[PDB]
Amino acid sequence: IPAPPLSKVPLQQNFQDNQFHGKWYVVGRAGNTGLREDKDPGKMFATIYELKEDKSYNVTYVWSGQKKCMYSIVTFVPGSQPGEFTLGNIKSAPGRTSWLVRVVSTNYNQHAMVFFKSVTQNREGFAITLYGRTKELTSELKENFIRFSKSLGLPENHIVFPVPIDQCIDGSA
Amino acid sequence: GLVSACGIIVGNIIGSGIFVSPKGVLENAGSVGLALIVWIVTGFITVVGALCYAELGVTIPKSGGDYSYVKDIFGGLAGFLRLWIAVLVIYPTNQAVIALTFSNYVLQPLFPTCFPPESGLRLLAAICLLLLTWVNCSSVRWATRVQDIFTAGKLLALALIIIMGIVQICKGEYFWLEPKNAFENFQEPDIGLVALAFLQGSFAYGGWNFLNYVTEELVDPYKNLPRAIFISIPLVTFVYVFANVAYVTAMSPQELLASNAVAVTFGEKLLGVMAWIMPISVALSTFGGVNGSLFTSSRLFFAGAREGHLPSVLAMIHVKRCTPIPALLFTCISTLLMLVTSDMYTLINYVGFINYLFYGVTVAGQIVLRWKKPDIPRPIKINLLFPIIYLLFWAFLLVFSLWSEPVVCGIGLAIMLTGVPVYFLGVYWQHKPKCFSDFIELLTLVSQKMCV
Amino acid sequence: GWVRTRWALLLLFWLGWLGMLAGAVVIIVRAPRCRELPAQKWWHTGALYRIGDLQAFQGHGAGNLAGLKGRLDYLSSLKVKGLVLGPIHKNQKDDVAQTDLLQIDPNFGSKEDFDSLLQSAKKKSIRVILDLTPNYRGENSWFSTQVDTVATKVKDALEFWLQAGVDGFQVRDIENLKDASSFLAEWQNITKGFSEDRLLIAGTNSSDLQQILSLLESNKDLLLTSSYLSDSGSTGEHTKSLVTQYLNATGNRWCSWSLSQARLLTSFLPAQLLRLYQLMLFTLPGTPVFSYGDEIGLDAAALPGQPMEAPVMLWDESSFPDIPGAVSANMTVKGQSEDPGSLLSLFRRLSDQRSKERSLLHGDFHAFSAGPGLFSYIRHWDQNERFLVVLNFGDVGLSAGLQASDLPASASLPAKADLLLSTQPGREEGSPLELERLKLEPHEGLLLRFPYAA
Ligand SMILES: *[C@@H]1O[C@H](CO)[C@@H](O)[C@H](O)[C@H]1NC(C)=O
Ligand SMILES: *[C@@H]1O[C@H](CO)[C@@H](O)[C@H](O)[C@H]1NC(C)=O
Ligand SMILES: *[C@@H]1O[C@H](CO)[C@@H](O)[C@H](O)[C@H]1NC(C)=O
Ligand SMILES: *[C@@H]1O[C@H](CO)[C@@H](O)[C@H](O)[C@H]1NC(C)=O
């Protein structure tokens, strides 16, 4: 199960960073990470992208922990392509796992599909995510996501749709 | 004797140390692989040192190997220190170590899980030592007679270890021999501990510094002696490595470090009839080792007295029995005084350090004799790489031993420095000490005449 | 007297030598003989590692039994003496007719893969424990539709897999099993009858001691894992009471010191108590059972979108490539393997000590009184190295205040003892301390070592 060629994954043309900012939900996850269709998908979490004056994104993962609403913050620096990104806080140490975030296709209104890669010294991993503005997207987008994931070689079982919980990702609790 | 030479060399080198050393090396090696590497390196360095000593013997043919060489070389105060340290340190401590080994092997079956009482160990060691010194004093006939049965017991123990090791490597899966869990197992290697590992491994190789010249009788010693030295020591090293792998196959390395008698536990794990074979055979081996050490120490006392450094009180053979009773009594007293250490392996370090401290000195003397006073007829010559590499290793050993365990080694150095002044008193007296010393000596001689 | 003195001294020397021999024999007979070692079954040594969901444990790995052999090197690094593979047998949710306990699920692998895995584990000295819970994909582990058929198929599967070579089994969620103790006794005695080195673990969610004791009444040689210590309590006195109550009610029989059934420590415990509870579980008298990921303190709520029941094992920062930067370096196996002070390193050290020390393996356990908030006890064998563990479950720095005279004099407390390791930094290992005035930091655990008195 090798990493796909970067050329094969599409890119979003005329990528407008201003529109992409906001709170995306995760409505599908494809990748050889350990999750399978048969088992528990998990609890849906949200990713908040805030655009900065230097065009770098501030990314906040919010999810529901044991009892605390849990948050985590990172920063994406724009890559070579307008729609590509890389994890910020780069250091010369080879131990760091370079990241190759890449937006595959989005209408900026209700859905998006993005591709992540985590090339590492001893490992090369990738994943695809179906971001959505609402808790649940229409079935057609899920079918398109499954087709695109299968294009990269991921079996059907590797694709997972987290349960749309109504606490922390949306509201308080 | 083209072939018997290898036999005599192997018999002199191979002893009971293999029954006590293996816990010492591994305990400091930290892994089975490092243990076997230490054994191999010690074997090679012993080959080098024996070769240098053979060269020195051919260049300086004189009785008292390792003493005459250090006497004719370095002038005075060097050979006297060799004799002083050999009498005070090396022989009493070798006898004490072998006696403690006998006691540990005798008592291991009775207390397999927990330390036996220290008083029991010391009493059994003293019992063995006193019986052996008595049999040596009474007559040399019995001393040479019992050596056959003791050597037979030692050979039986070694042969059974080797056989039960080769059987188990086929079916025992050799879990620890393979690199799986065979390196960096107990602790990360430390050079300070590796020096102590080499000191304890060298204890297995003994009786080559002085027994490779005093005993050689070859048809063409110049032609054959280098061959014998090069072909007898390596097979001894192979035997030691085979014994170590047999131990590690029979028992886990952790189980080997908490035994105090490696062969007893080996026989327990493998031999169904264990107690009837291993402890008794090793006890015979230790008896033979102590008896041989006693005979050799008395022989050394003979030359020590003849050279005039020692008083005539010693090295006096009894008339009815042709035995050096006064020489044996002093070694017995010194060994009994050494038997209050309570540590089987501390003594090993304490002796090995001194052994190396003088082996290196002798090799340095060889180098000096090469550089200064050359052109001497040397029937067999050695490439100057071997002595210098030996010296390099010797320096490492000493430095790191002092870095790691500066107490036992320090005490040995202090003993040597305490022996240094006596030589001046012997050589030059600013004022003759006729008030006490002479009278004391006379009284001692009189008493020796009266009771012995 | 000139010649008479010679013979007199010679015979006096022989008399003294014989007196020394008699004294040696007397001392040997007076010495205390070593106590026999117990029947140390393979699971009495070291911990057990419950792998649960293999697909989650391997993460980016293959996800099948054939791919599980890659991790056996890591598990050997942990020095766990056993594995509890999740239920691999083929199962249709809530269908007793369509579930078979003798067929491996196609997704998990094939029979040949399982045989190769068992061979490799045996080569590495790891022993597999196949858990045979009939309905592991359903809401209730034991089908409600039928009872007798489920037990019959479990017995048949136990026979078949014992023939295959598994070194034991495990049965979970027994609270839902009807007529549990009888079936447990039957399965346990059949498994022991096949061979002595074969354990049957039992899992319950009950936290009441009386229910556990009733379950153990029929068979006293059954390893039971239950949520008994799961209640955090947050008081050392409470945990001390739980441990002593259980040990003295069960009769000091061998027990499994697992914090739960098929759950991680991080579900019950907060982040700051993981090291303390690891020390306690590794030093208490029994066989600690750890769910996978407990060595790195894996928490299902630490990362977004991670299943609560079966969190994905974090082997490196690329374990989740969908959330860049969320998986910090120091919450992974690779990150914590390079840190001398980390939960994984502490787990490795404690497992090593548990596996090799003859006082922790099989040794008497005696807890004694400390100022309230402290759980302090001693593990000691016969004239062997003794260990003393002092745990500060409170959140306020407390003077240890050890005062233990009720303990046997054979395990008397010396004035000083080494410091084998501390859960928190700030102390020098190997330095003897003053037990009379030993200070303890909040949420700190000290493992001290002292030798046999003589
Ligand atoms: C185990 O005990 C049960 C009790 O119901 C019995 O039926 C079965 O034969 C026993 N099996 C043994 C002792 O192997
Ligand atoms: C534990 O098992 C009992 C028995 O079926 C059940 O009633 C209960 O809901 C379970 N959960 C807890 C937390 O006790
Ligand atoms: C166990 O300990 C408790 C502590 O309260 C005590 O009441 C009980 O009698 C003890 N039982 C046994 C058998 O030791
Ligand atoms: C190390 O792990 C702890 C978890 O106890 C976490 O709080 C801390 O942030 C981690 N280190 C860094 C640099 O984030």
Numbering used by the authors:
A (entry chain C): 8 to 180
B (entry chain B): 41 to 492
C (entry chain A): 177 to 630
The authors write:
The human heterodimeric amino acid transporter 4F2hc-LAT2 is a membrane protein complex that mediates transport of certain amino acids and derivatives thereof across the plasma membrane. While CATs are N-glycosylated, LATs are not but they associate with type-II membrane N-glycoproteins from the SLC3 family, i.e., either with 4F2hc (SLC3A2; CD98hc) or with rBAT (SLC3A1), to form heterodimeric amino acid transporters (HATs). Anticalins are composed of a central eight-stranded antiparallel β-barrel backed by an extended strand and an α-helical segment.
The 4F2hc-ED sits on top of LAT2 and forms a complex with D11vs. In order to support the existence of the three observed water molecules in the substrate binding pocket of LAT2, a set of four all-atom molecular dynamics (MD) simulations of the 4F2hc-LAT2::D11vs complex was performed under near physiological conditions. No significant structural differences were observed between our structure and previously reported 4F2hc-ED and 4F2hc-LAT2 structures.
